[PDB]
Nucleic acid binder design. Structure first.
Lengths: 98, 73, 73, 73, 44, 49, 95, 146, 279, 195
DNA sequence: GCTTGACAAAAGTGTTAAATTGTGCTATACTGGGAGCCGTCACGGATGCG
DNA sequence: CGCATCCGTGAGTCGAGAGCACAATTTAACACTTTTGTCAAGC
């Protein structure tokens, strides 16, 4: 509808619902979404962190897509933190205990 | 002694350790008397490397022959 | 040479020697008696690889007794 | 059998490093460091040992300044 | 202390700005005196 | 001479192919000097003459 | 098996004095070079973009003693004289 | 023998737009340069020199420049069945390889579930030739992987 | 060839007459430009005509650390030079003259671009001569020729032969497969020889700490002359006059102070603590 | 070209694609793709969706697709491609710096050919060679047969340095060798406590 | 302690002779390469041939 | 339009193992001068 989402793209339920409820106020035309099952490989490779996706598999394709999309990575994924050398955000590493 | 009687499926013109399925490394009935079914590596090379049998001989074409006793009547 | 090293040498009157030590030293954790030595010198034939003037081989033999951690079968 | 603890015991505290990655070399021939593989990192994350993992991956491997500062400390 | 890591598509201007000098010789090191050659690879 | 990055030229899918809508087989010939491609045509001038 | 590649007290308060120059290239790109107080600044410099740059102040125009390279015409002269070339030109001009 | 077989395979040779020819024959081994333990101690290969008689013929006149040529040092096998290369004892292990020939097989299709039969001719050297039967009941051939 | 020469002279004449004005009839000018264009076209046509000879000569030098197409390109550059130098008056076929230049260009390009470490042509010639002589000797001698015999045959000292052989070495790839598997390369075994050694880097800062503190302080102001003498305060060793250029101390007095300090600082009571950092 | 030279323009090589991208409007293409997606049903809809996936990236951003054509290739610092003097005077060099050399060589030759006005065939051949050299530098063996040096082993390109199981991501970032570590055979201690 | 003075012994420039290196040239005729190609094995997904 | 080909990607973790002729550029080599330090007597 009046949303930012491209048709046919996989969007998280949280973001989908947030966008629909944000646009319904003044736009009044939410997008339609069908639940879909996806495998572990595709689910992991669809993460929002390009660092972890590149580290997992298909480094060339992941880097190409990230470059053309020009998408930045927020460094909190329990896998890019080790790459950066920053202590992980789990266990003793969270702010509360740290 | 066992090194000199080693039969390998790898090397140029042979198999690749990453491209060898179950079928090639399994024991085949024709091995009897030519390739020992016991002696073979335990690790990933299981079934790709073997040893020549005691009585086995190599045909000039490269096929392994084994001796048998002729029995008639 | 660093200023501190220069002062240390001055107080001890030690020459800034032209050569640095590169002697062959026993690897870490090794031991045993020296049994054989072989020397090849380009002067007396000794057709060594180009640029090599001397080649020295030292053989060290040690007697190992069975101990904890050794593998038997 | 030829599996004796005498020739496989080496430990390391500090030794040679790699040219490019600046990480410790591997192998008993050099002062080889043990590899802290990906599965070990998964185990550390499962424990929640954020600090031990951080020091393993930075201080003890390739934090060039951190290595010498930690030795001095 | 990093906030985020952004990837993009490098342009000619960015590549030129990254550089401290143009390489215009395939020489790496001279055969005698084993020192880097001017304007080539490994140029000081 | 300008060159095209190999990653975007052919990567299954070809990013340049999708951007311009030229088939990879046709796009391949242009890059490696195998066939000409028209960059611009003057329609107004053609109609008047 | 080992290889080799081709520690002084750092101090920021005290450093050798320096003076900054200024160069323009053919494309109008400005560059700055810190030289020592000894000066002896050259009239032309090599910039990061691979083009010769000249002083902003506009002093010491170099003589430019370079000689032009040998051309096809010079190579022709070494095997032909003007008379034969003129005859050939006259012959061709008729057609 | 193997050396004789290879030499016969190589020769005779004539140049493009043939006008003169060359050939090799009669390999010969004379004697090992050194012995086993001398080679082991001195760090040198245990080989013997090889000589082959080469004949050069001029078709225009019918000349024969026949004489022996030194082919190099051929490593030799010791009594134990090992090769001493650079003072180190080495063993060459026999290799199991699919012999050249024509091989037929059959497979059950997935779409039609018909039995489809294929044959491949595997040479020592040369283009691969293989015939096939399709699920449309047609006999085809792929020549040189075309 | 005649068309090319005519075009060259036509353009040269046009350039010469441009300076002195003297506008010519339109027909003559048009004809002159037509001659120039025809000459350029003839030059090109000859080049495409002999590209096949270029390829034929280039295909002989494969497998010597240079791409086949690069050899072809260098050969055609040499052929361009040959065309520029070809003389039709001598009456010889163009191929006879072109082959020399094509071979020269190919060999020179190989010499200048076939090695990671570039060797000048004058050394490449010596190396090639050495190789040819060695190959010739191996056939008749039967054995491996020794350095001295080669040196005598080349009228040079054996040390020169050894130096040439050392120069002949080719760098090896740093990405090999030492390990018999796709697991380790050659770069994983070459230790860095410039990495800071921890313990050493500590000992030094202890030596700089146990020296600058004690022996310097017990010497009162006599420490200053020592510090400037060896430059341990700013890494700037100073000559005697560099102290007298500002301060009023004189030359010989500074040396006397240095000698006295040197003598008295070697006392074992204060010369034993610093006696363990000599190594 | 001879009949109607001034009525059109054509070209070959990366320059033609550069011109096409320069005079290629993205908003109109995105609009047309969206209208085809909402209207079409057959394979046209799938093609439009896939094309829009790429087109929208440049439309809804501050970056232009001109980056796909390169006017200046960067060079990695020498330390990451070291020329180390091995023991005994031998030199070991990463094959990466070999690839670079080739590029430069070809890039020089072209500059010469254009300078003296070589026939178009040779210039085009040189441009194609430069394209192939750059391609192999970025990704060896992708398009054609991989470039090989001594023996027959293909050269290690830039992409190979961080591509698979080896490289940097899975060999030097996610897990690495560490100091203050040892290894040895284990035996049973029955007198030990659990800790 | 602090200077002056008379002398070898090294730090620096000048100028030559020598070694190194970068280019050019050689005229019977010669005119489209050659390495190919070897048992996963399954999985998707894009491509391109008809 | 639709089917067959073709392509990319994945594979436990540690271990042990042809030549010559110039012209231009850089280097050693020697001679000599200036700076540095050394020894002696001194009040």
């Amino acid at each position: 509808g009046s949303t930012e989402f491209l048709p046919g793209s996989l969007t998280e339920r949280a973001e989908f619902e947030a966008e629909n409820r944000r646009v319904v106020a003044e736009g009044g035309e939410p997008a339609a979404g069908r639940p879909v099952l996806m495998g572990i490989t595709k689910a992991s490779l669809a993460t929002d962190s390009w660092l972890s996706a590149a580290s997992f598999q298909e480094t060339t394709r992941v880097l190409t897509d990230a470059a053309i999309n020009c998408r930045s990575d927020k460094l909190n994924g329990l896998k890019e933190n080790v790459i950066i050398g920053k202590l992980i955000p789990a266990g003793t590493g969270i702010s509360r205990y740290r | 002694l066992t090194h000199k009687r080693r039969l390998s499926a790898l090397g140029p013109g042979g198999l690749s350790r990453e491209r060898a399925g179950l079928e090639v490394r399994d024991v085949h009935p024709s091995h009897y008397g030519r390739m020992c079914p016991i002696e073979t590596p335990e690790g990933p090379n299981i079934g790709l490397i073997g040893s020549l049998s005691v009585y086995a001989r190599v045909n000039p074409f490269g096929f392994i022959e084994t001796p048998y006793r002729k029995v008639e009547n | 040479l660093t200023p501190e090293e220069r002062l240390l040498r001055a107080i001890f009157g030690e020459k800034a020697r032209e050569v640095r030590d590169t002697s062959l030293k026993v690897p870490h954790g090794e031991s045993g008696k020296v049994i054989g030595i072989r020397v090849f010198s380009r002067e007396d034939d000794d057709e060594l690889p180009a640029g090599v003037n001397e080649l020295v081989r030292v053989y060290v033999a040690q007697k190992r007794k069975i101990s904890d951690g050794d593998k038997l079968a | 059998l030829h599996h004796l603890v005498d020739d496989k015991i080496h430990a390391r505290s500090t030794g040679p490093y790699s040219m490019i990655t600046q990480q410790p070399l591997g192998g008993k021939a050099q002062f080889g460091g043990q590899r802290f593989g990906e599965m070990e990192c998964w185990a550390m994350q499962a424990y929640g040992a954020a600090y031990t993992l951080q020091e393993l991956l930075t201080i003890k491997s390739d934090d060039t300044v951190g290595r010498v500062k930690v030795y001095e400390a | 202390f990093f906030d985020e890591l952004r990837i993009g598509l490098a342009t000619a201007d960015d590549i030129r700005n990254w550089s401290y000098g143009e390489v215009k010789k395939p020489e790496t090191i001279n055969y005698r005196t084993l020192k880097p050659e001017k304007d080539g690879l490994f140029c000081e | 001479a300008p060159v095209t990055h190999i990653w975007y030229f052919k990567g299954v899918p070809s990013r340049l192919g999708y951007l311009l809508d030229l088939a990879p087989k046709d796009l391949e010939k242009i890059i490696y000097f195998a066939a000409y491609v028209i960059t611009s045509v003057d329609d107004e001038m053609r109609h008047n003459e | 098996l080992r290889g080799s590649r081709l520690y002084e007290t750092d101090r920021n308060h005290d450093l050798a004095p320096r003076q900054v120059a200024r160069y323009r290239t053919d494309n109008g790109e400005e560059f700055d070079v810190p030289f020592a107080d000894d000066a002896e600044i050259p009239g032309t410099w090599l910039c990061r973009n691979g083009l010769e740059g000249t002083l902003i102040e506009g002093d010491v125009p170099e003589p430019k003693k370079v000689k032009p390279p040998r051309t096809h015409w010079d190579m022709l002269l070494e095997r032909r004289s003007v008379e034969e070339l003129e005859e050939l030109l006259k012959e061709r001009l008729d057609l | 023998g193997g050396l004789e077989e290879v030499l016969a395979e190589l020769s005779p040779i004539e140049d493009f737009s043939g006008s003169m020819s060359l050939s090799f024959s009669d390999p010969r081994f004379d004697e090992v340069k050194a012995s086993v333990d001398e080679c082991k101690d001195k760090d040198m290969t245990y080989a013997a020199p090889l000589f082959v008689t080469a004949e050069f013929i001029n078709n225009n006149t019918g000349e024969i420049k026949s004489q022996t040529v030194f082919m190099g040092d051929f490593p030799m096998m010791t009594e134990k069945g090992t090769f001493i290369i650079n003072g180190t004892e080495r063993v060459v292990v026999s290799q199991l390889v699919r012999s050249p020939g024509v091989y037929f097989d059959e497979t059950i299709d997935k779409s039609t579930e018909k039995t489809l039969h294929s044959v491949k001719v595997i040479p020592g050297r040369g283009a691969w030739l293989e015939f096939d039967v399709d699920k449309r009941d047609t006999v085809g051939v792929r020549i040189d992987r075309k | 060839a005649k068309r090319i020469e005519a075009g060259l002279y036509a353009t040269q004449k046009l350039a010469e007459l441009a300076e002195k004005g003297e506008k010519l009839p339109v027909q003559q000018r048009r004809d002159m430009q037509w001659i120039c264009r025809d000459g350029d076209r003839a030059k090109n046509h000859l080049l495409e005509a002999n590209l096949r000879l270029v390829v034929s000569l280039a295909k002989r030098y494969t497998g010597r650390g240079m791409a086949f197409l690069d050899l072809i390109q260098e050969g055609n550059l040499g052929l361009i030079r040959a065309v520029e130098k070809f003389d039709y008056t001598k009456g010889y076929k163009f191929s006879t003259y072109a082959t020399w230049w094509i071979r020269q260009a190919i060999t020179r390009a190989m010499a200048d671009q076939a090695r990671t470490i570039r060797i000048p042509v004058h050394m490449v010639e010596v190396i090639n001569k050495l190789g040819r002589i060695q190959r010739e000797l191996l056939q008749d001698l039967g054995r491996e020729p020794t350095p001295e015999e080669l040196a005598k045959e080349m009228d040079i000292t054996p040390e020169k032969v050894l130096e040439i052989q050392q120069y002949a070495r080719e760098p090896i790839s740093l990405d090999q497969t030492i390990g018999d598997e796709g697991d380790s390369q050659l770069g994983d075994f070459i230790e860095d020889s410039e990495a800071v050694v921890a313990v050493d880097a500590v000992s030094f800062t202890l030596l700089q700490d146990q020296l600058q503190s004690v022996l310097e302080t017990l010497s009162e102001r006599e420490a200053g002359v020592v510090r400037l003498r060896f430059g341990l305060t700013d890494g700037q060793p100073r000559t005697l006059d560099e102290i007298g250029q500002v301060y009023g101390v004189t030359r010989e007095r500074i040396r006397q102070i240095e000698s006295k300090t040197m003598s008295k600082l070697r006392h074992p009571s204060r010369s034993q603590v610093l006696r363990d950092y000599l190594d | 070209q001879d009949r109607y030279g001034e009525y059109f323009t054509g070209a070959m090589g990366a320059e033609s694609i550069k011109k096409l991208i320069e005079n290629f409007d993205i908003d109109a293409e995105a609009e047309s793709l969206r209208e085809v997606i909402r209207s079409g049903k057959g394979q046209k809809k799938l093609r439009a969706l896939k094309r829009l996936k790429v087109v929208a990236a440049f439309q809804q951003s501050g970056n232009s697709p001109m980056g796909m054509v390169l006017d200046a290739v960067p060079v990695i610092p020498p330390e990451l491609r070291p020329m180390v003097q091995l023991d005994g005077g031998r030199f070991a060099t990463s094959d990466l710096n070999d690839l670079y050399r080739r590029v430069i060589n070809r890039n020089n030759r072209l500059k010469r050919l254009i300078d003296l006005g070589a026939p178009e065939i040779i210039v085009n051949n040189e441009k194609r060679m430069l394209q192939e050299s750059v391609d192999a530098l970025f990704d060896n063996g992708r398009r054609g047969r991989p470039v090989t040096g001594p023996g027959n082993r293909p050269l290690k390109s830039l992409s190979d340095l961080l591509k698979g199981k080896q490289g940097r991501f899975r060999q030097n970032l996610l897990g690495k060798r560490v100091d203050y570590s040892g290894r040895s055979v284990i035996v049973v201690g029955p007198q030990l406590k659990l800790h």
